Amino acid sequence: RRAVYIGALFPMSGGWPGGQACQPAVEMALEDVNSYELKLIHHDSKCDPGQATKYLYELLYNDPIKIILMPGCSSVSTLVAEAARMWNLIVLSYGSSSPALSNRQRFPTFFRTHPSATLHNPTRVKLFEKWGWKKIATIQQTTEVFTSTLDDLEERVKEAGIEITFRQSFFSDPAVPVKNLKRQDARIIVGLFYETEARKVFCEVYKERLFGKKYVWFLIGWYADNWFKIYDPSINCTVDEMTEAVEGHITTEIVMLNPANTRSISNMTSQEFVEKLTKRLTGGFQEAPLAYDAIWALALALNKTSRLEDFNYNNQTITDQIYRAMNSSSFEGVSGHVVFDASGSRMAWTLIEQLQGGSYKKIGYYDSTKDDLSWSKTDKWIGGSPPADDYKDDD
Amino acid sequence: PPSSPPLSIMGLMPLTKEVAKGSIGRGVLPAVELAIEQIRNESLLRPYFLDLRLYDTECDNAKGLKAFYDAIKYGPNHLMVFGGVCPSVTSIIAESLQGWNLVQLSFAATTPVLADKKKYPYFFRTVPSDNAVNPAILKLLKHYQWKRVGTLTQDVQRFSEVRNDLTGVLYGEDIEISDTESFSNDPCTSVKKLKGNDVRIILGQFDQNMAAKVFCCAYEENMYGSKYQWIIPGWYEPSWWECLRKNLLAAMEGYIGVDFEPLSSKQIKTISGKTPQQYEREYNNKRSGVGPSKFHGYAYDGIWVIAKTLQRAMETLHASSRHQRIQDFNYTDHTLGRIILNAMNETNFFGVTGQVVFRNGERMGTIKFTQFQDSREVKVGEYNAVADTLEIINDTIRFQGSEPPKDD
Numbered sequence A: 001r002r003a004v005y006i007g008a009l010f011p012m013s014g015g016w017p018g019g020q021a022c023q024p025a026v027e028m029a030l031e032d033v034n035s036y037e038l039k040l041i042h043h044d045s046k047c048d049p050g051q052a053t054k055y056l057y058e059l060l061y062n063d064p065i066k067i068i069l070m071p072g073c074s075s076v077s078t079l080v081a082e083a084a085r086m087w088n089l090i091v092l093s094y095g096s097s098s099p100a101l102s103n104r105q106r107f108p109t110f111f112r113t114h115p116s117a118t119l120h121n122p123t124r125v126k127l128f129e130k131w132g133w134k135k136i137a138t139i140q141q142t143t144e145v146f147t148s149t150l151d152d153l154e155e156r157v158k159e160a161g162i163e164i165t166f167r168q169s170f171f172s173d174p175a176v177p178v179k180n181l182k183r184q185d186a187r188i189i190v191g192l193f194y195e196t197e198a199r200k201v202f203c204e205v206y207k208e209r210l211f212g213k214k215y216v217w218f219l220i221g222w223y224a225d226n227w228f229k230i231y232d233p234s235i236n237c238t239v240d241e242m243t244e245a246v247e248g249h250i251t252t253e254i255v256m257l258n259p260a261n262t263r264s265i266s267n268m269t270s271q272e273f274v275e276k277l278t279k280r281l282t283g284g285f286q287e288a289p290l291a292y293d294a295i296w297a298l299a300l301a302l303n304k305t306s307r308l309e310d311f312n313y314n315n316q317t318i319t320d321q322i323y324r325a326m327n328s329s330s331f332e333g334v335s336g337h338v339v340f341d342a343s344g345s346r347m348a349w350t351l352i353e354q355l356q357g358g359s360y361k362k363i364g365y366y367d368s369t370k371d372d373l374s375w376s377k378t379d380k381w382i383g384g385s386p387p388a389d390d391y392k393d394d395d
Numbered sequence B: 001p002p003s004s005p006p007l008s009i010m011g012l013m014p015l016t017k018e019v020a021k022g023s024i025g026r027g028v029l030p031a032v033e034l035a036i037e038q039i040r041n042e043s044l045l046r047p048y049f050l051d052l053r054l055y056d057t058e059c060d061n062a063k064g065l066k067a068f069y070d071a072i073k074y075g076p077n078h079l080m081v082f083g084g085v086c087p088s089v090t091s092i093i094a095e096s097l098q099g100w101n102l103v104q105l106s107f108a109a110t111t112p113v114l115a116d117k118k119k120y121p122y123f124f125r126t127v128p129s130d131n132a133v134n135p136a137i138l139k140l141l142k143h144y145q146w147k148r149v150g151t152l153t154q155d156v157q158r159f160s161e162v163r164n165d166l167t168g169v170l171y172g173e174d175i176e177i178s179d180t181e182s183f184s185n186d187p188c189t190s191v192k193k194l195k196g197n198d199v200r201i202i203l204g205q206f207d208q209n210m211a212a213k214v215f216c217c218a219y220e221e222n223m224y225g226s227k228y229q230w231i232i233p234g235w236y237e238p239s240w241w242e243c244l245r246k247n248l249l250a251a252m253e254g255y256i257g258v259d260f261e262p263l264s265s266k267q268i269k270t271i272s273g274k275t276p277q278q279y280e281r282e283y284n285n286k287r288s289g290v291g292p293s294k295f296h297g298y299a300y301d302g303i304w305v306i307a308k309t310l311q312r313a314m315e316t317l318h319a320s321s322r323h324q325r326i327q328d329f330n331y332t333d334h335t336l337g338r339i340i341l342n343a344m345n346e347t348n349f350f351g352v353t354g355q356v357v358f359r360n361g362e363r364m365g366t367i368k369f370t371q372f373q374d375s376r377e378v379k380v381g382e383y384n385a386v387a388d389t390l391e392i393i394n395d396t397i398r399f400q401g402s403e404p405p406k407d408d
């Protein structure tokens, strides 16, 4: 039983604190896979490329040799996947949604169990069509995960005869973009940023009065449920002001846990995985099934390739064999049917929610493959119906 | 001398003939060599010597990161980083500095996000950044009495950050941004919106490829001539333009470009005892198998910043302890990193690029104004950030009308 090491990064804080539930999910999966021996060497990236750079150095320049790298965040995964070719290392992410990571020329040894963020876009388009909007505004924080999602959204809106009439971007301070959205009289707004930046955006939204009956915000649904209620020294807005600014907004997220009560390769049902993970415990709870399945995907790919002690960073041979096994992966995990295609579309469903009276309510689900919008009729709007995308009365 | 200890510096830049940007690294090396030559001849760092080690980034994220990692693993105990030319490579290095207690000095990375001190606390640059054009434009607007402007920005980080910075520069200044327009791949819709809002003075922030599309849309919308003033980035490649060419040229006539000033116009003796003009001639004589680089003066002054920082880092009556701490450095000493950071922060001398001084790691320098006049970019002015003064060159700047355009 030779030891085989995984060099992993877990974000315990930062943009997406996914490591909080994904690290225990990885630990639960390793126990199951082991019972060669798969061993974990891990560090807290804090969802920070600067911090990950120090830990990447320690993983690569210190013994033991690692067969695979496992990063979380899109920014950390982008840095490690770009660099990995220099060490002929396979990179496997459990949390990276960045559409840009689908670029095989730029990331030739990269795999992910997390779907591409492009899956939010057909759902956003379906809702724009449902609600009769042809004019949308966008505000994004400048991490590539968001910029590349917006690049895809621009293509999907153009295809549907919908226009992005105003765009604003920021690196850290959204003050100017939000003021400009207000002055442009933008109505339907898609905001792409991490939870941390979402608080800064919504405090500016409160100050500019860019909320109410006329305004509809579309955000990413994987924030913590209480995201707008959390103390933040970088914001002057109170909890009640924040709560009013976020009222009625729409979110989209990808369904990552199998909704059917079946038993996967691990012999667990989606429901038992949740109790088991809860027994071990939170950021990354919704992504935890992907972390669990990433270990299984690796374990099965290592089994098929089976000379592992001889892996070196200067040799392509073992890398190419593992790549081919990963490429041909096909098994049933807690997240459903696990496979590894370039454009990251193995998941068929998105979950749509609306914030009502400070709490998220499920309003529907969308399957872009079959074009099925499952609607709960649980959405609420001031006056009983959604607003317009602009004034229509100036003859 | 064999008894002369090294003060090792990690030089990171593109050098290879295989990459287009290798010409920058190769182009600044004669400037670097001249500074090192004189510092040693003067024994400014006595009994030590400045040991600059060179590592090729190849202007590539993966190769740049490995060059850095290999410099740490296998090179001598570097005290600081000198370089970073390609913005993406510079960012990867600059954000990670604290992990190895390394202060970095760049002579070529101009992107605005590197000014973020929360993300890049240990990062310094001798070159004025892309945001440095904003206080200069403010002085230009005040000069020609332009109180109403429109903005046209490409929705990309480096441009949106300059535009966001602009609001803060214009605050309390009595200049209105009457219309803010942004585009991703097609400026035509945004140009049409600016025309519809009767904007006359346009502040543009977009790349070289987008500039041709912008001027083509301006031509189609008749947003050029005596009634209009376009103020755009001045860092594009020479003859970047070379719409039918004649129509593009009609729309481009009189546009103002804004960029850093490569060398000081003042005939004053710098820290080296040489005027900027004498340095320029010595630079052209030293370079042999390389084309000139517009960052050469910034690289030259950059070596002087490192030398003056090191000299300051050694100024203590606790001499033997300080020398021992320097000798012992192995990236783990937070105290030495702090001493170096504080010493660099104190920089204040007259360099070949003008007065070399930092404001929160950003260069307080000189901005050059150019105007497009018949397929040639003519220098029309200089803005000095320290003095906050604008000097317009007499008999250079021209307007198609009898008077400069009105803002309305």
Ligand SMILES: *[C@@H]1O[C@H](CO)[C@@H](O)[C@H](O)[C@H]1NC(C)=O
Residues within 6 Å of the ligand: B342, B345, B346
């Ligand atoms: C850096 O230099 C500035 C300008 O002279 C000074 O105000 C500031 O205190 C310095 N920062 C330190 C010493 O940490």
